[PDB]
Every structure is written in structure tokens, then in C-alpha cells.
Amino acid sequence: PQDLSEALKEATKEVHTQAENAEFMRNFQKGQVTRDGFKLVMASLYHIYVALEEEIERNKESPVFAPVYFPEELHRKAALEQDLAFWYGPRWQEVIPYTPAMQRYVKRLHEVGRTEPELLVAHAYTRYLGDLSGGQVLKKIAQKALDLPSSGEGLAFFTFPNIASATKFKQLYRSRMNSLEMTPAVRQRVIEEAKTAFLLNIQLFEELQELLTH
């Protein structure tokens, strides 16, 4: 369609379902998620966000990204640091896993940020908008299935404190995306990069499931 935001949603509809159907996510939705599995997901998110936010800072003033730069409203690295300290303890930095599938995702993020900057919006879209809307239902399930202590930590990642209304912010983000000027060719690559983002997540889910079933 005309608006990039609409083009992306329509183009990734198929892969999004694929992600929902992934064995690991199927069980997650059914409330069948273990602490070992959740820990792996949080570790994955930490690595992904460190890379994404490092690249966003590199291109924050570029015309190809500036319109969608919302550091205070969206940054997740600090939240994930707090969460991992809870799930893996004070020495989390020395023990969290960094698997091949996680590395593959991180690798593509740095390549885009350093050599194909105009495609970074595809990754910011996939991660932030997804976690902002989809992650909200997953948080509900997680807490009810994790039966964790009342220590007030572990799920900060699921709360964006600097966003008063998810729907209102998501409308704003879409508008900003639609203001990005790109040639039809670039637009096509952005669409494809978004699909690639979903595929990287799907391959990650497949790897995590394999690791947990021994």
C-alpha cells in the first residue's frame, strides 16, 4: 500500500504467524514456559537490544533514521540489565549464554547499522512495535506461569515507563515512519529486511527449543 507502515504490516503478516506458530512460542502462549526457557529468552533480548541500540545511536542524526529516533520512550538495554541481574544473579555478565543463533541476529544488526543504515528502521520496527504490542500479552502469561517471588524484579523489560499510551505512541511511530523519504527500490529492501528480522527471530526460537529439550 501507500503508507510504509501499512506496507510493512501487510508484508510481514505471513512471517508473523510463522513466529506465532514456532514450537517455543506455541508453548509460551499456552502458558507452558519454564524458568530455564524464560531465562534464555531474556538473555537473547539483552544481546539483541545492545546491538540495535548501539547502531541506533550511530545513525540517530541521519536522515534515514532521525524521524524514528525515540531514545527515552523506547530504550530497553537498562531494563534488560536489571532483569538479568535478577534471573542470573550479580555475576550475570559472566554466565549469560551467547549462542550462535543470537550471534547471527546481532551480526545482521551491526551490518545494517554500519553499511546499510537506511534499513535500520526495519529492525527498530520489528522489535519495538512488536514488543510494545505483542509483548504486552506475553507479559501477562509469563508472570502467571513463572510463579516468582514478590521481589519486585525480573520483568522490567515488559514495561515502557516513558510511554503513557501504547496505542497513541504506536500511531505516532507509524506517522514518523511514513515521513521517511526513500526511493521505491529502498522501500522494497526495507520491506524485505523486516521479513529478514522475523526470520532471525524464528531461527532463534528454533535454537532455544533445541537447547531445552535434552
Ligand code: HEM
Ligand atoms: C507468539 C507471540 C506473539 C503474539 C501473541 C503477538 C501478538 C501481537 C499482537 C496482538 C499485535 C497487534 C496487532 C495490531 O493490532 O496491529 C502484534 C503486533 C506486532 N507484532 Fe506480534 N506477537 C507475537 C510475536 C511477535 C514477534 C516474534 C515479533 C517479531 C520480533 C512480533 C512483531 C510484531 C510487530 C512488528 C507488530 C506490529 C504490527 C503493525 O505494524 O501494526 N510479534 N503482535
